[PDB]
Design a protein around this nucleic acid. Sequence first.
RNA 1: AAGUCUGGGCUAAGUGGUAAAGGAUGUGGCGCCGCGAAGACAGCCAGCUGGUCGAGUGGCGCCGCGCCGAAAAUGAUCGGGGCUUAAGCCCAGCGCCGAAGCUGCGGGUCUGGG
RNA 2: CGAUGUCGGCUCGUCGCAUCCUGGGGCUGAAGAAGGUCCCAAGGGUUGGGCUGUUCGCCCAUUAAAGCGGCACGCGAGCUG
RNA 3: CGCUGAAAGCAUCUAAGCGGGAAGCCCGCCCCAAGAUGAGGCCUCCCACGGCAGCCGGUAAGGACCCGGGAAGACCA
Lengths: 16, 140, 204, 174, 37
Amino acid sequence: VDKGSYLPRPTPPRPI
Amino acid sequence: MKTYVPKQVEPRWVLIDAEGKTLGRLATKIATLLRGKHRPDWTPNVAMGDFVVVVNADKIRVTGKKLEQKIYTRYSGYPGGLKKIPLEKMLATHPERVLEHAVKGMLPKGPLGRRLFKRLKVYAGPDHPHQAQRPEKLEV
Amino acid sequence: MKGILGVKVGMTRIFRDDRAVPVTVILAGPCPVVQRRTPEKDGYTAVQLGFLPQNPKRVNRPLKGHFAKAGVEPVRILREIRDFNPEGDTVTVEIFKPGERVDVTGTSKGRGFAGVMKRWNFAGGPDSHGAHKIHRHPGSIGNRKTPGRVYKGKKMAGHYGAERVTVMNLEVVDVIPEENLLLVKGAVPGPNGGLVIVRETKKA
Amino acid sequence: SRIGRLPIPVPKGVSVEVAPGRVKVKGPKGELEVPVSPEMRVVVEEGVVRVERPSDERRHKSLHGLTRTLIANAVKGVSEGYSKELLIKGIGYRARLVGRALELTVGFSHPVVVEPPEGITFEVPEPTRVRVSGIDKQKVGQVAANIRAIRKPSAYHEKGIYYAGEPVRLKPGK
Amino acid sequence: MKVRASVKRICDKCKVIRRHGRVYVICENPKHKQRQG
RNA sequence: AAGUCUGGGCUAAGUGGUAAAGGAUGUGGCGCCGCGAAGACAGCCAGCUGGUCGAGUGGCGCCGCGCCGAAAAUGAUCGGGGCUUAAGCCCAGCGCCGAAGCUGCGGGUCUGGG
RNA sequence: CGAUGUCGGCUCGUCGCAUCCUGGGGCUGAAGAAGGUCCCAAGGGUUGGGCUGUUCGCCCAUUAAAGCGGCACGCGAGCUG
RNA sequence: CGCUGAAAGCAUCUAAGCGGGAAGCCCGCCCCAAGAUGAGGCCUCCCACGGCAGCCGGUAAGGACCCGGGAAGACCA
Ligand SMILES: [Mg+2]
Ligand SMILES: [Mg+2]
Ligand SMILES: [Mg+2]
Ligand SMILES: [Mg+2]
Ligand SMILES: [Mg+2]
Ligand SMILES: [Mg+2]
Ligand SMILES: [Mg+2]
Ligand SMILES: [Mg+2]
Ligand SMILES: [Mg+2]
Ligand SMILES: [Mg+2]
Ligand SMILES: [Mg+2]
Ligand SMILES: [Mg+2]
Ligand SMILES: [Mg+2]
Ligand SMILES: [Mg+2]
Ligand SMILES: [Mg+2]
Ligand SMILES: [Mg+2]
Ligand SMILES: [Mg+2]
Ligand SMILES: [Mg+2]
Ligand SMILES: [Mg+2]
Ligand SMILES: [Mg+2]
Ligand SMILES: [Mg+2]
Ligand SMILES: [Mg+2]
Ligand SMILES: [Mg+2]
Ligand SMILES: [Mg+2]
Ligand SMILES: [Mg+2]
Ligand SMILES: [Mg+2]
Ligand SMILES: [Mg+2]
Ligand SMILES: [Mg+2]
Ligand SMILES: [Mg+2]
Ligand SMILES: [Mg+2]
Ligand SMILES: [Mg+2]
Ligand SMILES: [Mg+2]
Ligand SMILES: [Mg+2]
Ligand SMILES: [Mg+2]
Ligand SMILES: [Mg+2]
Ligand SMILES: [Mg+2]
Ligand SMILES: [Mg+2]
Ligand SMILES: [Mg+2]
Ligand SMILES: [Mg+2]
Ligand SMILES: [Mg+2]
Ligand SMILES: [Mg+2]
Ligand SMILES: [Mg+2]
Ligand SMILES: [Mg+2]
Ligand SMILES: [Mg+2]
Ligand SMILES: [Mg+2]
Ligand SMILES: [Mg+2]
Ligand SMILES: [Mg+2]
Ligand SMILES: [Mg+2]
Ligand SMILES: [Mg+2]
Ligand SMILES: [Mg+2]
Ligand SMILES: [Mg+2]
Ligand SMILES: [Mg+2]
Ligand SMILES: [Mg+2]
Ligand SMILES: [Mg+2]
Ligand SMILES: [Mg+2]
Ligand SMILES: [Mg+2]
Ligand SMILES: [Mg+2]
Ligand SMILES: [Mg+2]
Ligand SMILES: [Mg+2]
Ligand SMILES: [Mg+2]
Ligand SMILES: [Mg+2]
Ligand SMILES: [Mg+2]
Ligand SMILES: [Mg+2]
Ligand SMILES: [Mg+2]
Ligand SMILES: [Mg+2]
Ligand SMILES: [Mg+2]
Ligand SMILES: [Mg+2]
Ligand SMILES: [Mg+2]
Ligand SMILES: [Mg+2]
Ligand SMILES: [Mg+2]
Ligand SMILES: [Mg+2]
Ligand SMILES: [Mg+2]
Ligand SMILES: [Mg+2]
Ligand SMILES: [Mg+2]
Ligand SMILES: [Mg+2]
Ligand SMILES: [Mg+2]
Ligand SMILES: [Mg+2]
Ligand SMILES: [Mg+2]
Ligand SMILES: [Mg+2]
Ligand SMILES: [Mg+2]
Ligand SMILES: [Mg+2]
Ligand SMILES: [Mg+2]
Ligand SMILES: [Mg+2]
Ligand SMILES: [Mg+2]
Ligand SMILES: [Mg+2]
Ligand SMILES: [Mg+2]
Ligand SMILES: [Mg+2]
Ligand SMILES: [Mg+2]
Ligand SMILES: [Mg+2]
Ligand SMILES: [Mg+2]
Ligand SMILES: [Mg+2]
Ligand SMILES: [Mg+2]
Ligand SMILES: [Mg+2]
Ligand SMILES: [Mg+2]
Ligand SMILES: [Mg+2]
Ligand SMILES: [Mg+2]
Ligand SMILES: [Mg+2]
Ligand SMILES: [Mg+2]
Ligand SMILES: [Mg+2]
Ligand SMILES: [Mg+2]
Ligand SMILES: [Mg+2]
Ligand SMILES: [Mg+2]
Ligand SMILES: [Mg+2]
Ligand SMILES: [Mg+2]
Ligand SMILES: [Mg+2]
Ligand SMILES: [Mg+2]
Ligand SMILES: [Mg+2]
Ligand SMILES: [Mg+2]
Ligand SMILES: [Mg+2]
Ligand SMILES: [Mg+2]
Ligand SMILES: [Mg+2]
Ligand SMILES: [Mg+2]
Ligand SMILES: [Mg+2]
Ligand SMILES: [Mg+2]
Ligand SMILES: [Mg+2]
Ligand SMILES: [Mg+2]
Ligand SMILES: [Mg+2]
Ligand SMILES: [Mg+2]
Ligand SMILES: [Mg+2]
Ligand SMILES: [Mg+2]
Ligand SMILES: [Mg+2]
Ligand SMILES: [Mg+2]
Ligand SMILES: [Mg+2]
Ligand SMILES: [Mg+2]
Ligand SMILES: [Mg+2]
Ligand SMILES: [Mg+2]
Ligand SMILES: [Mg+2]
Ligand SMILES: [Mg+2]
Ligand SMILES: [Mg+2]
Ligand SMILES: [Mg+2]
Ligand SMILES: [Mg+2]
Ligand SMILES: [Mg+2]
Ligand SMILES: [Mg+2]
Ligand SMILES: [Mg+2]
Ligand SMILES: [Mg+2]
Ligand SMILES: [Mg+2]
Ligand SMILES: [Mg+2]
Ligand SMILES: [Mg+2]
Ligand SMILES: [Mg+2]
Ligand SMILES: [Mg+2]
Ligand SMILES: [Zn+2]
């Protein structure tokens, strides 16, 4: 069932 | 002065007729003999107890309704792998395991307890193969 | 219980009452008894059968001894049949008459490292609609923190075939004793030239 | 107000030997042994057997009556013998003997063959009455019960295998 | 059979008997047969 | 590690070792009437009385301990083994074991008095 | 909160039983057949479609039946988005 | 669901005892399996080696290496 959404949609970073 | 610690002794072999005796009350004694705590020079970090031979272990006796109600249990590691076996059936199929399981649970866990367990020789029927060792008949 | 060793030679169909019937032909005879197992000696009842003649150049001394005590020429294969005690010193296809039902054991064909789809008939992944490098993949293998592990016996990729298989209750369609031949209805495990065992069925 | 302490008449000439935990009762129709609680003491008097209990607590009172009746039935067993009679009611329904065996023809697609166990005799007078007989009372009642179970009395119709003297209680039909 | 936590006599011909750790009520009337559970 | 310790009693469910309204000829213990050698209760022979049986019998209340009511998700279990005139529960005892508490012996340091 | 990725689907299951079906029963206002209701039972089984992101639900055509729940509303270092 | 049957003269599947009774339970079928360290069993083969429950060395029965391959196979087996 649709409830909240406690996190943004993710995306990977870039270390260096 | 420091406490006496014995040098290795010749262990004693022992014979017990399990017939008609109560499962747990017999097991209790078999364990003690195994640990050798009947010996005045008892040492907790070495095997110095007796070898215990038991006969007529199929004729062990038990109180209450435990023939039909006591459940021995085994988990195989697989899903739904818990097998259940009642006393009655265990006696019918592997009677010596009854007395063996009881005793094993009353031994210490760990490397020594496992060794002490191996010095236990249980048989169904009145005969045992160790007359070579000439075990001394015990009354318990 | 009765049984014989044999080799799988090949498949055909024959005609019987205006019906085509798929058969697998098996070269079974002849099998010399080379040892008997007895309750007083071994604790159970069976007959060790030899099969196929071997160049005695390749049979070592411990094996030579075994054969000699049975008064039997060197054979390539030894295998037992439990609860079988032929009155004879030699076992042939004649122990099976047409209409009998049999159990045939062989060594299945080996697929080596088999994907979860070939091995376990998994559905695999979709082939379009965004499916990402998972077209032949098995999916989830578990749950989460509880139980936080994977069950024993989880169907997974791995070796497949080249293992002992028994197909049961096959009709004996014919037997051609003069060629040590057995015709069995249907399919038998393993490749042509494969060692197989034929036993009287255990179904009723 | 008591069963165990009521004395058991023993006919001529049936004997009653007594052992621990059992009594043997022989007579003109056969012999059979009666297992008895070791807590109870049976007693061999003149032409009569008595049972006495060691106290007046519950288990002992219960064992008392049972033991007396148990032996009384054994006594009557080897002398008079035991029987039960079965009524076969229903049109197509009938019974007959085939050797020692009993053949029930009672509405199935097949007839049913009941084999008499050891110590049991079958009789078919009319083809609608069956007699189960033997020296063992519990065995007779059991087999009789067995025969009846083949086709218990219908609830709506006077049809099936009946006990002699069992009433025909019925429910209305539509 | 009725299976209830409260098994009672329904008619004067009902009988509260107890077999195998369980309380039953048996009777001439089949409807009155009860087992506690 | 130290009692298979002693004496009286209850429990038969492994209760002990997970729960309620409520239900029950479970078992033990008290209590109160009813009914009966002028023959009660039960069963066999009649119409709540009659006849042969020859003892007890039927209802009510409290108390102890148990029974049911009691279905949930990975493999079970009172911590385990195992325990039934107990290794359970109630009452009364004697003994032991058991901590870095207390004691004995030695030492350190501070404080107070010499 | 110096991160425990959040619905639904797909894949793969596994467990519970308050049981949808199949097996065994008692009662029935159970004639038969077919139902009702409660008891035992978790071994196996529990279909394909239209609509909507849907879970759910409705509908079509069937079925022995088209069970209800737990597993981080099972499963995104397995996929989808 | 019964048989027999007291406590409780009747009755009661139960308190002694005995039956019947599920796709379910245990065997039975198929497959793995003695690291089952509780390491099982049978048949066969070699054998009494030289040096000072150990050591160095040469062999026996046998094993491996290497090669030609293989409906066996990732390598390995
Ligand atoms: Mg929310
Ligand atoms: Mg005892
Ligand atoms: Mg003892
Ligand atoms: Mg001792
Ligand atoms: Mg005893
Ligand atoms: Mg028991
Ligand atoms: Mg698992
Ligand atoms: Mg399983
Ligand atoms: Mg399961
Ligand atoms: Mg389970
Ligand atoms: Mg298992
Ligand atoms: Mg299984
Ligand atoms: Mg410890
Ligand atoms: Mg045999
Ligand atoms: Mg083979
Ligand atoms: Mg594949
Ligand atoms: Mg593949
Ligand atoms: Mg491929
Ligand atoms: Mg493929
Ligand atoms: Mg496949
Ligand atoms: Mg496919
Ligand atoms: Mg597919
Ligand atoms: Mg698909
Ligand atoms: Mg595909
Ligand atoms: Mg993408
Ligand atoms: Mg792609
Ligand atoms: Mg899973
Ligand atoms: Mg875990
Ligand atoms: Mg595996
Ligand atoms: Mg392989
Ligand atoms: Mg067929
Ligand atoms: Mg007909
Ligand atoms: Mg019926
Ligand atoms: Mg009407
Ligand atoms: Mg009900
Ligand atoms: Mg009510
Ligand atoms: Mg009333
Ligand atoms: Mg029962
Ligand atoms: Mg009644
Ligand atoms: Mg004591
Ligand atoms: Mg004692
Ligand atoms: Mg005492
Ligand atoms: Mg209980
Ligand atoms: Mg318990
Ligand atoms: Mg409990
Ligand atoms: Mg409670
Ligand atoms: Mg209460
Ligand atoms: Mg109450
Ligand atoms: Mg009382
Ligand atoms: Mg008076
Ligand atoms: Mg009267
Ligand atoms: Mg309970
Ligand atoms: Mg449950
Ligand atoms: Mg349940
Ligand atoms: Mg639980
Ligand atoms: Mg639970
Ligand atoms: Mg559970
Ligand atoms: Mg569970
Ligand atoms: Mg005491
Ligand atoms: Mg101190
Ligand atoms: Mg000091
Ligand atoms: Mg100081
Ligand atoms: Mg200070
Ligand atoms: Mg000073
Ligand atoms: Mg946070
Ligand atoms: Mg960090
Ligand atoms: Mg962190
Ligand atoms: Mg992080
Ligand atoms: Mg995480
Ligand atoms: Mg879909
Ligand atoms: Mg997918
Ligand atoms: Mg799909
Ligand atoms: Mg699961
Ligand atoms: Mg599920
Ligand atoms: Mg489970
Ligand atoms: Mg319900
Ligand atoms: Mg439905
Ligand atoms: Mg059904
Ligand atoms: Mg059903
Ligand atoms: Mg039904
Ligand atoms: Mg109707
Ligand atoms: Mg009707
Ligand atoms: Mg019907
Ligand atoms: Mg029904
Ligand atoms: Mg319902
Ligand atoms: Mg249920
Ligand atoms: Mg199921
Ligand atoms: Mg399920
Ligand atoms: Mg659909
Ligand atoms: Mg759709
Ligand atoms: Mg939808
Ligand atoms: Mg879901
Ligand atoms: Mg809904
Ligand atoms: Mg909706
Ligand atoms: Mg709508
Ligand atoms: Mg249909
Ligand atoms: Mg239907
Ligand atoms: Mg649907
Ligand atoms: Mg529904
Ligand atoms: Mg579901
Ligand atoms: Mg869930
Ligand atoms: Mg979560
Ligand atoms: Mg949730
Ligand atoms: Mg989820
Ligand atoms: Mg929640
Ligand atoms: Mg779901
Ligand atoms: Mg789900
Ligand atoms: Mg997740
Ligand atoms: Mg994940
Ligand atoms: Mg992702
Ligand atoms: Mg997702
Ligand atoms: Mg993760
Ligand atoms: Mg009756
Ligand atoms: Mg009777
Ligand atoms: Mg009677
Ligand atoms: Mg009587
Ligand atoms: Mg009984
Ligand atoms: Mg009892
Ligand atoms: Mg039975
Ligand atoms: Mg019957
Ligand atoms: Mg079937
Ligand atoms: Mg092997
Ligand atoms: Mg094998
Ligand atoms: Mg080995
Ligand atoms: Mg092996
Ligand atoms: Mg090995
Ligand atoms: Mg082991
Ligand atoms: Mg062996
Ligand atoms: Mg070996
Ligand atoms: Mg062996
Ligand atoms: Mg051999
Ligand atoms: Mg020599
Ligand atoms: Mg030599
Ligand atoms: Mg020398
Ligand atoms: Mg060497
Ligand atoms: Mg060589
Ligand atoms: Mg090569
Ligand atoms: Mg190659
Ligand atoms: Mg290959
Ligand atoms: Mg290589
Ligand atoms: Zn009633």
